[model samples]
Target: PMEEEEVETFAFQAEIAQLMSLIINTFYSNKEIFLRELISNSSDALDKIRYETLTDPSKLDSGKELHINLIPNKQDRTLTIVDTGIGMTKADLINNLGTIAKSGTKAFMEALQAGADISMIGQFGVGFYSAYLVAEKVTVITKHNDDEQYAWESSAGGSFTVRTDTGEPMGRGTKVILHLKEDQTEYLEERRIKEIVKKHSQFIGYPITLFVE
Candidate 1:
């Protein structure tokens, strides 16, 4: 039997927590924009690995085909977005999600005070939090070339927890699960999801598939 995994918990950095609150409340004009931001983020991850392969072919050891999958589970009321891209390690998850490392909180607040437009509103390293606009909870399962698979879970703007994944290997990629809120049930409809994908991710530079029943 496999050993029981040790789970780690961390509070979001103050800036990240504040940023998440703002993103959930103000950044997006429509909730579906979350899907666009996530798809864009996935494409960026794939681009990172593609650029890496130029100098180190071993980066493609996990498999070279890059794609994105959107799976909506009506029964569970969950939408899972999977990507074949450069996945995040434990440190990457904590640093990327738990803290705003790229653009600090001050710049974001200044933009808000300046009455930024939706297009002018930047991610400021907090785009991932946009999922909270529709999801009561979100889970991220990722596997990177340099680290074992792990799962990160959080509910809205609160603290997050991480642990070694005991599930089957994902090869190399990231999977995001959005546990839809009661009012967000429209996300479970295949037609609605397809429309959102076409609207926001048409030029994502990778094949994006929606698994239909």
Candidate 2:
């Protein structure tokens, strides 16, 4: 068989560099937003898988309620965003975290240049990269439906590393860990997270439950 078609790659525009910096500088006010963002991501993933299962029940082999979990550690002052959704592959992390500006920024710029709808475009995941604006260390644990569990960890402004986990311990989804700063310790409380969840993502189709006493 002949080789398949090859995809072409392009360099990111210089303006995108300035735009990304501006976007990150104005991203989030505090660290508590990790809860809202992660939960929202989870809800989106759950919605995706559920929509697939609706067409074919075989998409889900077992009965499981789709939900989001927020686990906080006062000891280490770490906040964990856990969910049971479609996990990431080795490639997803790179594209998702790296070169995000290249993904849709160019198209969005083209739309702006053509006087199209830029309002709807800018609001999409604009705050995602802000995870680094708060936490010094970030960790992601995920298990995709088609593959085994894995863990990816990284520090700010550095390349992330990957590893295989002993077990998922959470079925299928993504868990984001945010190591909180010393001054921002309120995130470790259960009530704070629940309250924030109710405020922003309450209506997210999936159940946004917090582990409580």
Candidate 3:
């Protein structure tokens, strides 16, 4: 007898899929800009936790220092960004990434067609999809105080999958893995990554570390 594998999958809503396809064609002039969006999102997450700790001091009792780490793996040709901010639960992942806001998507398209600066795209919360600008695949490993750790993976296509994290727990935070595309190998270079961080993320409030071999 053979045992079958269990896999959970989620299909992106119709409009959400259309928005992703639109961004790939019309958004982001520079591929490096994806890193900036990711760092900014991480910074926002940290801000949320900091505000929560104001009323509930125990939120900081996790002892997880608020910081961001950029890990570049040359062998794997991947770049992983880790943040000790408020992590996401499964519902958050589904709501945030799987479903693009109706009003937001409408505005996004309007702005895009009107020749507005793409920087305005983040305001719509679709910035997370920018990783597909440089990554063929994206993996999100997150742990929230209220939920067990989980992993969400997608190719920025029409669907994504979520599953219980079987690896080491992050304690409380998130790790985003970007599997670089073949032509985007420059992302694995330490010098290039540092340049992008300095240009866009130096002003971030939290410490941003570049892990080097």
Candidate 4:
């Protein structure tokens, strides 16, 4: 059975059903935390390539700086968190979303259950789902090191699909696009997104660019 390129759909785990609802509630206060969650993951992505390339020196990109960009599209009402980092393959594009990190950051996990607000701590999976707070759907377009490009999508629904990209090939990195709900259109304002980042992600290791459109 040749299943290559077959449209594949994966459901979020049962445990994450609570996370989807509960984590969405976690945004009640500032709503800025969700964006912080994103930058954290983006930085960690570059950090991965940064660390690996330190010894190997083969996976490095010539002109791609390890940076994150907040690209707001006013016409379309979408905000994209773009990162020129080690992109996610199909394996990680699925596994990395909608789950809690069970690794060394489990300490940060317990506190999350207790409702203590934390900063950019290394967990990409958990922060991803809460993005539902500001947008209606999450779209991920990514290419890993010499890996095939892919597009992933979800509406914080029970299920989402993944597919190989048919558009122009990107050299590397992930672009997570959040389709703004009609009610959330104010997020299309560049000043809004920039204000949030200034308070939280200013200390991030990599350069953060607000892509002017």
Candidate 5:
């Protein structure tokens, strides 16, 4: 239930829209890539927090328990990826997700037009879009040291909305929830997730907690 004043929506830059199109269709192969790209992004954010903490110790959160957490809800058909990392501010959400700051986009599009099913997300950026490879919608809940928590929601549409996080609060970090496509629900299996991480994120800096004790 979104009140009009609570959620703000913005159009995706033309490049982002095109990138989403290509990712959901052309480069869409091997569901493993989505999870791998996400884990790597979380790893980047974790290390980013550590690096920032070196300059400002107050950024150290949850003490030494920096980690990534995965939540798979079979009933909801959703898989959530959580990380206590650098997180994001409201502006960060818009700027980072809404537009392409880096210039790799043009080259990626060029490669695609040249008949390439490119899979190296690190090369051309836009790794977050990989979630759309399996998810029908994605919700990002992020908290930054500089600002309050906010939620960003979109369903691979031309635009996305941002809202003040009015529900559960995170101590610090980000949580990304992927509402899976019906045909793509196989990713919810614990064995599958564990196997994916073992193959893709064995050397990640943070210990990812996929199971809750």
Candidate 6:
């Protein structure tokens, strides 16, 4: 079942299914780590966008407010992590969530393959997938450089789905919605989430607030 516009394809070099299973299982065990990483990630993203806006304030609205909002909704059993940062394009959402070494950083691996500057991974960004460990479903609504907002969702059951939307825009940046599991109710609690943010992310240099039901 090939599409008429079959422009590209790729193949993993090893037993991908088994590797992915192991990775996913181990990843689930470290769900707490995701909170820290995600917050840190948002901080970095804001840094980039701020730098860009500094050069060209028109790139993104100057007064949009760069911050992180950790919203936990008990009614819907969902936790949304929102940030005003360098959001992704639709193609970025696909390549980013779909493959490793994405974001074209892989092309520079030859210079640093054996011992390359690993910081490039930040630019390539495959770390977001860690959300799958805790949430049964994940949705990312992002607006990049004032482009039309789009939605990217997945259950991590081997595939994902994406679509365009005129729905509630983030104003600017990325909003990750984590539909929490019944057993992971602790994350939905205000105190627990607040403590985690203050402990690991207090010195992040940006305001991090949590909204609870």
Give the TM-score of each candidate.
0.89, 0.72, 0.89, 0.82, 0.91, 0.76
Instruction: Please provide, for model 4 over 60-141, each residue's C-alpha lDDT reduced to its tens digit, 9 standing for 90 to 100.
Output: 7633478888988988888999887889888888787643333434444466677766443334345665577777788999
Displacement of residue 51 (Cα, Å) in model 1 is: 1.4
Q: Write the per-residue lDDT of candidate 6 for residues 66-140, one digit (tens) a residue.
A: 899999888898889989989888777666656434444344334234544433323444446456556778888
lDDT of each: 0.83, 0.62, 0.83, 0.75, 0.83, 0.67
> What is the per-residue lDDT of model 5 for residues 1-59, given as tens digits with 9 covering 90 to 100?
86554778888889888877777765445667788888889999889889888898877
Candidate 3, residues 1-213, lDDT tens digits: the string is 985545589988787777777766654666687899999989998988888988888887665599999999989988999998998988887778685455577778678788776667688767787788788899999988888888999887789998888788898888999998888889888899999988877899999999986
Q: lDDT, candidate 1, residue 144?
A: 96
Tens digits of lDDT, candidate 1, 105-162: 6686577667764433336655676788788889999999999999999885658999
**Lowest lDDT block of 10, candidate 4:** 98-107
Candidate 5 pairs with clashing backbones: none
Tell me the lDDT of model 1 at 123: 61
Query: How many clashes does the backbone of model 6 have?
Result: 1
TM-score head-to-head 3 vs 4, winner:
3
Judging by lDDT, tell me the better candidate of 2 and 6. Answer: 6
TM-score attained by model 5? 0.91
1 against 2, candidate with superior TM-score: 1
Report how far residue 90 has shifted in candidate 4, in Å: 1.2
Q: How many backbone clashes does candidate 2 have?
A: 1
How many clashing pairs per prediction, in order?
0, 1, 0, 0, 0, 1
Q: Tell me the lDDT of candidate 6.
A: 0.67
**In model 2, where do residues sit more than 4 Å from their true spots?**
1-31, 99-122
